[PDB]
């Protein structure tokens, strides 16, 4: 069991086209979070957006019902690609 | 504080001081054979290959032999990092797949993200 930052990623609410997600903030400062999301497996490229490190929630929009999605959240840092924590990911079908 | 530029960053495939985790982000819209080569920020000289295959990223340590040659597989060792990458660009030789498409370089992040 690998740790990750952030840790407790879950869908708080779902609609046919949206997923409201949330996670637990770590003890440490995170500058921003990158959220990527894409249809599980192939075939499309993932979409992505970022939210401030002060956030622990986000809304993913423009999805299609009955589709399996893989959602990944990275803890990111200014002026650096030395992101030291494993991202966290979940699967969810609308 | 700011990491100096490594001479190897002239290569499209060498992205410099990038963590395993940042590499996964950088490869998230790649295809089979998308890859980058990275060094550790904290203790440089330790380099890795990150390679995309069937929607997953695979990470490989680059080893230094006792005579200074570099290799992923001890059966295929080279004088320079560029030679090693060029080798593995047609011969998997241990890698899940060949190193075919250097990942596009992105602007370094700011507090506002990436």
Swiss-Prot record, chain B:
Changing residue 52 to K: In a melanoma sample; somatic mutation. Disulfide bonds: none annotated. It is found in: Cytoplasm, Cytoskeleton; Nucleus; Mitochondrion. The modification Phosphotyrosine is found at residues 1, 14, 25, 58, 71, 101, 112. Residues 13-103 form the SH2 domain. Polyubiquitinated. Polyubiquitination of ABL1 leads to degradation. Coiled coil: none annotated. Widely expressed. Belongs to the protein kinase superfamily. Tyr protein kinase family. ABL subfamily. Non-receptor tyrosine-protein kinase that plays a role in many key processes linked to cell growth and survival such as cytoskeleton remodeling in response to extracellular stimuli, cell motility and adhesion, receptor endocytosis, autophagy, DNA damage response and apoptosis. Coordinates actin remodeling through tyrosine phosphorylation of proteins controlling cytoskeleton dynamics like WASF3 (involved in branch formation); ANXA1 (involved in membrane anchoring); DBN1, DBNL, CTTN, RAPH1 and ENAH (involved in signaling); or MAPT and PXN (microtubule-binding proteins). It is linked to Leukemia, chronic myeloid: A clonal myeloproliferative disorder of a pluripotent stem cell with a specific cytogenetic abnormality, the Philadelphia chromosome (Ph), involving myeloid, erythroid, megakaryocytic, B-lymphoid, and sometimes T-lymphoid cells, but not marrow fibroblasts. A chromosomal aberration involving ABL1 has been found in patients with chronic myeloid leukemia. Translocation t(9;22)(q34;q11) with BCR. The translocation produces a BCR-ABL found also in acute myeloid leukemia (AML) and acute lymphoblastic leukemia (ALL). Interacts with SORBS1 following insulin stimulation. Found in a trimolecular complex containing CDK5 and CABLES1. Interacts with CABLES1 and PSTPIP1. Interacts with ZDHHC16, ITGB1 and HCK. Interacts with STX17; probably phosphorylates STX17. Interacts with INPPL1/SHIP2. Interacts with ABI1, ABI2, BCR, CRK, FGR, FYN, HCK, LYN, PSMA7 RAD9A, RAD51, RAD52, TP73 and WASF3. This is Tyrosine-protein kinase ABL1.
């Amino acid at each position: 069991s690998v740790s990750s930052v952030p840790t407790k990623l879950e869908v708080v609410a779902a609609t046919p086209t949206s997923l409201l997600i949330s996670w637990d903030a770590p003890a440490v400062t995170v500058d921003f979070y990158v959220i990527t999301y894409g249809e599980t497996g192939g075939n499309s490229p993932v979409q992505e957006f970022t939210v401030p490190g002060s956030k622990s929630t986000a809304t993913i929009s423009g999805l299609s019902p009955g589709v399996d999605y893989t959602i990944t959240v990275y803890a990111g840092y200014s002026d650096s690609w030395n992101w030291p924590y494993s991202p966290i990911s979940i699967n969810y079908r609308t | 504080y700011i990491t100096p530029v490594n001479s190897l960053e002239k290569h499209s495939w060498y992205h410099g001081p990038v963590s395993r985790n940042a590499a996964e982000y950088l490869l998230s819209s790649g295809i089979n054979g998308s890859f980058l080569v990275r060094e550790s920020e904290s203790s440089p000289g330790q380099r890795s290959i990150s390679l995309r295959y069937e929607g997953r990223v695979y990470h490989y340590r680059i080893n230094t032999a006792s005579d200074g040659k570099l290799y992923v597989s001890s059966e295929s060792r080279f004088n320079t990092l560029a030679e090693l990458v060029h080798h593995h660009s047609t011969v998997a030789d241990g890698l899940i797949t060949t190193l075919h498409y250097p990942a596009p370089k992105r602007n370094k992040p700011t507090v506002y993200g990436v």
